[PDB]
RNA sequence: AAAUCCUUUAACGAGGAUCCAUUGGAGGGCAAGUCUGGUGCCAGCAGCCGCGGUAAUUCCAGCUCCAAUAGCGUAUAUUAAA
RNA sequence: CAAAGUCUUUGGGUUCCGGGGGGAGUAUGGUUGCAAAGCUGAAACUUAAAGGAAUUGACGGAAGGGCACCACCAGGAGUGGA
């Protein structure tokens, strides 16, 4: 407690934090980092990115290319730094979302006369929702105008971008010295540590070779040679490629770096005893002939029609909460067979181990999720496994890929490869909290077949949408509500949070249009969804606290079937039913308040609901996106 | 058969379980007085130390209630 | 938890349903409430009305005029 | 105990905005707020109908 | 210095869905709704008092209105009220 | 209340001392004492009231009166039993 000793404490704290920062900066880019990787996204159409990249290219270049795309290595010892540029087109939703989830600094190129473009807006909302590693804006046509329109064009840019990107300066590119300034900029930049990527180990694919087992098998050894950017990739673990499912690999080896900072041997084998294997599901499989019983007891455009019927049902289930018109011919206790009423929706119990389908025999339920996650992340952090470290230019010989993967890479599509943590390939019940972007106003029903990006995956699925409360019973939603945040739920592979939740929908022929976006809640089948049904009525005889209501049933013993379930009333009154009277649907009901003639007596019925089993892993190849 | 049924628990998923008389004299009264002296002294040494003990105990419990306020 | 000293803090989110905006481990500009450190009338032992969630405010997210990076 | 999250926001019948014309903005609003109060005034016995006298 | 802006000026440039004005509020302090619909001690509002347990002057939306107005909120230090 | 007066028409000298209520006369330190304890003396946090005079009398588990066979006594008829 003095002038000197507390300045000394300030000195110790500065030493601690600067040591931490110089620990985390040198190990990304350079003589330990793999390279520093920059992805390039223009937005408009007027950007001639060959002119951009040829201003940007120069140091020493090392020019790779692909069939269509053209990524390359860049090296300068002057800054002692490795860049790896990779160019992309917006709208190419598959390619951009597959290689900006493993990119490490995103460079947005912009036209001078306006900000985003609509295809770029689409990709921009996608990249916002799956996590920006680091953005850095740029423009190209500013030198072509003298000072007047130059300054005013920059002001129009900073006004047209600060409604989306609130604070950033526009580093212009006209000269190759502007490219030098841009590279000096992108060398020293605070990398937002994306929390999903660091908890695993992921390779990019710099080169792909293929050796088939037999060529008619169309299965064979894949050869991914690239760097390692995550944790220490262990060899007993599995591997996933983001476009073509998950599959277990055979050989890791470390050939030399083809491109150093300045100018067949393997370290590990498989052994299958410890190597976890591909068990995607549970691997275990004198009455008279005349008289009745009475006296005997005394003894193209159909799609638009479907759309308009969906808008009708969103009106009839959004003007109204969950109103259901009553059946008339079938006995109304049979069609509502497995319905039971709760007195209070929050409080009254409901056994979570009661009515499990035949498909709940094919899931892995965690007992304690949070501590198992802490144990797995604790083994990730403070341990060292026997596999190769970060930065190691390694090749993986993967045993069991098909050939069309190799052909899609020879097109120019990027492959990635991230390993799995223990219990990440098995299927269970996934719960995603999610909201709706105001880009699409299309109705999205309950069991719509959609496409998910839940944490570096790509799969068609069929959810059930829910209220998002931290209680036991959660209500089923019957449409995607345009402004609340809901919970979708799907049979799917299990994935440890955090993870971004993209959802898009086929408009027509591969036009994946974005609808929903969010993050990954607790994954467990115990969260049971409760589907509600409101049965309506009308109080056509009104006495003091007792009323006769019709149009809610049509038999008599239906009321004898739904007898203990309490009514409720839009004016707040909480009564419950007495005897029925009619042979048609009619009943007397006790109440607490007096009943208005402008009333709608209505009861509630509940069941447990659960999603359908669709985990078709393949996703159809998207087309370039355009405006509606 | 009206608002209740069987629905037993069957088939679940794969759970990955984690006094002074007249005739006394000098040194006869005084042994009794000195015994009362040592009784009173050791007894109030006890009382002082236990008041300090419950001071410590009240203080640590109100620290825990402060912690429960904040956390 | 804050950054700049390591103190842990309870803070408040103003509008309805805006807890859905925030996920764990996100940069939140915590701002205080107005009675200089005293609690609000209804809420016991809560000091601080959070404004910003990852460099955008809650008054834009509550009106939907912007979107939230992560 | 986190009970519910956002129950009253998205469960209103989401009534969108109607169409009007603009206000006069700047000085002409002050010309209106002067003439609406102190020129075409009605002589009033108790002054109970306020500027938003809505039933 | 050489320019840009400012000033001076040729030519185009005004019918209101435009060349469009927002930020807060409408129980009291405190200026202005017992208007209409939803939610129903929940979600929430609120600087304090209080509201909301089903006809809600406070919530959430529209419409109207208020104060300021190209500026207005909120947090914090501080001063007057003290 | 003959001072608890000569005080916004605010200045005769002069000492101690109070700034919402709790936390608290607790900590902790110094000091005195053989000891119990005495003197001086916090803060973290919490709460919108705690309090002071007077003022009505729903409630009396407070007391007195006064009435009634939709009260009792003395009794009748009973009902309640089938």
Curated annotation (Swiss-Prot), chain A:
Primary residence: nucleus
A GO term for molecular function: GTPase activity
Compartments in which it is found: Nucleus, Nucleolus
PROSITE patterns: G_BMS1
Keyword Nucleotide-binding: no
UniProt keyword annotations, A-Z: Nucleus, Ribosome biogenesis
GO BP field: endonucleolytic cleavage of tricistronic rRNA transcript (SSU-rRNA, 5.8S rRNA, LSU-rRNA); maturation of SSU-rRNA from tricistronic rRNA transcript (SSU-rRNA, 5.8S rRNA, LSU-rRNA)
UniProt cross-references to InterPro entries, sorted A to Z: AARP2CN (IPR012948), Bms1/Tsr1 (IPR039761), BMS1_TSR1_C (IPR007034), G_Bms1/Tsr1_dom (IPR030387)
Ranges of residues in domain Bms1-type G: 34-192
UniProt GO cellular component terms: cytosol; nucleolus; nucleoplasm
Compositional bias (Basic and acidic residues): 1-8
Function: Required during maturation of the 40S ribosomal subunit in the nucleolus.
Annotated family: Belongs to the TRAFAC class translation factor GTPase superfamily. Bms1-like GTPase family. TSR1 subfamily.
Name the record gives this protein: Pre-rRNA-processing protein TSR1 homolog
Biological source species: Homo sapiens (Human)
Swiss-Prot record, chain B:
Basic and acidic residues: compositionally biased ranges: 21-49
Purpose of the protein: Essential for ribosome biogenesis.
Subcellular location, record wording: Cytoplasm
Disease affiliated with this protein: Inflammatory poikiloderma with hair abnormalities and acral keratoses: An autosomal recessive disorder characterized by mottled hyper- and hypopigmentation of the skin, sparse scalp hair and eyelashes, sparse or absent eyebrows, and palmoplantar keratoses.
Tissue specificity: Expressed in the epidermis.
Signal sequence region: none
Similarity remark: Belongs to the LTV1 family.
Stated name of the protein: Protein LTV1 homolog
Tree of life domain: Eukaryota
Region (Disordered): 19-49
Source organism of this protein record: Homo sapiens
Entry coiled-coil feature ranges: 20-71
Swiss-Prot record, chain C:
Subcellular locations according to the entry: Cytoplasm, Cytosol; Cytoplasm; Rough endoplasmic reticulum; Nucleus, Nucleolus
N6-acetyllysine modified-residue sites: 63
Main function: Component of the ribosome, a large ribonucleoprotein complex responsible for the synthesis of proteins in the cell. The small ribosomal subunit (SSU) binds messenger RNAs (mRNAs) and translates the encoded message by selecting cognate aminoacyl-transfer RNA (tRNA) molecules. The large subunit (LSU) contains the ribosomal catalytic site termed the peptidyl transferase center (PTC), which catalyzes the formation of peptide bonds, thereby polymerizing the amino acids delivered by tRNAs into a polypeptide chain.
Subunit structure: Component of the 40S small ribosomal subunit. Part of the small subunit (SSU) processome, composed of more than 70 proteins and the RNA chaperone small nucleolar RNA (snoRNA) U3.
Family: Belongs to the universal ribosomal protein uS12 family.
Pathological association: Brachycephaly, trichomegaly, and developmental delay: An autosomal dominant developmental disorder characterized by brachycephaly, ciliary trichomegaly, dysmorphic features of the face and hands, hearing loss, and developmental delay with short stature. Intellectual disability and autism spectrum disorder may be present in some patients.
UniProt protein name: Small ribosomal subunit protein uS12
Gene encoding the protein: RPS23
From Swiss-Prot, chain D:
Residues carrying N6-succinyllysine: 47
Region spans: Disordered: 6-32
Positions with biased composition (Basic residues): 19-32
Transmembrane segments: none
Subcellular location: Cytoplasm; Nucleus
Any coiled-coil regions, as ranges: none
Purpose: Component of the 40S subunit of the ribosome. Contributes to the assembly and function of 40S ribosomal subunits.
Subunit structure comment from the entry: Component of the 40S subunit of the ribosome.
Name of the protein: Small ribosomal subunit protein eS30
